[PDB]
Design an enzyme around this catalytic site. Sequence first.
Site, short mmCIF file in Angstrom:
data_model
loop_
_atom_site.label_atom_id
_atom_site.label_comp_id
_atom_site.label_asym_id
_atom_site.label_seq_id
_atom_site.Cartn_x
_atom_site.Cartn_y
_atom_site.Cartn_z
N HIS A 40 4.10 -14.12 -13.88
CA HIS A 40 5.27 -14.62 -14.02
C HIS A 40 5.23 -16.12 -13.59
O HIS A 40 6.05 -17.16 -13.70
CB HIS A 40 6.61 -13.96 -13.55
N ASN A 54 1.86 -27.52 5.85
CA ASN A 54 2.91 -28.44 5.40
C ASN A 54 2.64 -29.00 4.15
O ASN A 54 1.73 -29.76 3.85
CB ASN A 54 3.49 -29.76 6.34
N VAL A 57 3.10 -32.90 3.39
CA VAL A 57 2.46 -34.09 4.20
C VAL A 57 0.96 -33.86 4.08
O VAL A 57 0.36 -32.63 4.17
CB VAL A 57 2.86 -33.80 5.76
N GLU A 62 -6.83 -30.14 3.36
CA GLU A 62 -6.40 -29.77 2.26
C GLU A 62 -7.55 -29.89 1.25
O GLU A 62 -8.31 -30.72 1.36
CB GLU A 62 -5.08 -30.29 1.40
N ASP A 84 2.05 -7.50 -13.45
CA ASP A 84 2.58 -8.99 -13.15
C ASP A 84 1.41 -9.55 -12.40
O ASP A 84 1.38 -9.70 -10.88
CB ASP A 84 3.78 -9.02 -12.16
N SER A 172 10.44 -11.38 1.31
CA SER A 172 10.10 -12.56 0.48
C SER A 172 11.27 -12.90 -0.60
O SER A 172 12.26 -12.36 -0.31
CB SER A 172 8.83 -12.14 -0.32
N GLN A 174 12.48 -16.18 -3.67
CA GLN A 174 11.94 -17.24 -4.60
C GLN A 174 11.16 -18.18 -3.86
O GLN A 174 11.53 -18.92 -2.98
CB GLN A 174 13.33 -18.18 -5.05
N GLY A 175 10.03 -18.54 -4.62
CA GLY A 175 9.14 -19.52 -4.02
C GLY A 175 7.87 -18.91 -3.21
O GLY A 175 6.84 -19.45 -3.35
N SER A 177 6.83 -16.25 -4.93
CA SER A 177 6.11 -15.43 -6.09
C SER A 177 4.82 -15.77 -6.24
O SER A 177 4.30 -16.93 -5.91
CB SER A 177 6.85 -16.23 -7.28
N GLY A 178 3.96 -14.84 -6.45
CA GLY A 178 2.61 -14.75 -6.68
C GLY A 178 1.83 -14.96 -5.47
O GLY A 178 0.50 -14.82 -5.52
CA CA Z 1 -0.32 -30.44 3.34
#
Ligand code: CA
Length: 223
Positions: A40, A54, A57, A62, A84, A172, A174-175, A177-178
């Site tokens: 989904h 974060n 930021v 990353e 799913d 958990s 919304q957001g 998800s997955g």
């Molecule tokens: Ca970051």
Amino acid sequence: IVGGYTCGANTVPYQVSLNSGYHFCGGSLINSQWVVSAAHCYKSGIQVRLGEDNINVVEGNEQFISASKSIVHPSYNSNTLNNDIMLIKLKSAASLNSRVASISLPTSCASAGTQCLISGWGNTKSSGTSYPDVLKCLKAPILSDSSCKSAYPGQITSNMFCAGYLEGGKDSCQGDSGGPVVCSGKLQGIVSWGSGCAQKNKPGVYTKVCNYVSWIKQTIASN
Ligand SMILES: [Ca+2]
């Protein structure tokens, strides 16, 4: 995540953020070039963001890598959310390190009562809306199939399990998800659905990853 805690930067190194101009879903890195998420969460134009804490930021750990392809499970039903699960391939392999690391697939299914770690950047309120910038964590037990089915009559398939607290307050949302449900260092669940968040007798429902190991392995081996 409602009723959770701040994980700490890069303490959940397999957690990814799926970004299409903004964070919209979680995922789990399962090797240097593949992510597991919820079906989904499917859309075009996905950038996978690894090494995030974060998400607003740039903090220095990353890796941003565009998806080259997505593969939704062939039997995914978007109405019932049965099956799913989806695989996302990265255009280039992530550089694996202590802060960006894959999570092992299960060799067996986890039982009711097993403690797991659920994580994500989803809503932290059960009524309001507040989205955290940093990764949130929740320790939660897998619930019995019987209690899961009792909470959600007619909706729990063999490819789903409940985890959390029937009393509510911790879940958990919304957001998230997955995103991952990891138990004893294995990816056992994917954040899939629930009725609201952290509501009494409405625990989180998760994709049962152990049912998909053969599909995941075979798909990765030919794509
Ligand atoms: Ca970051």
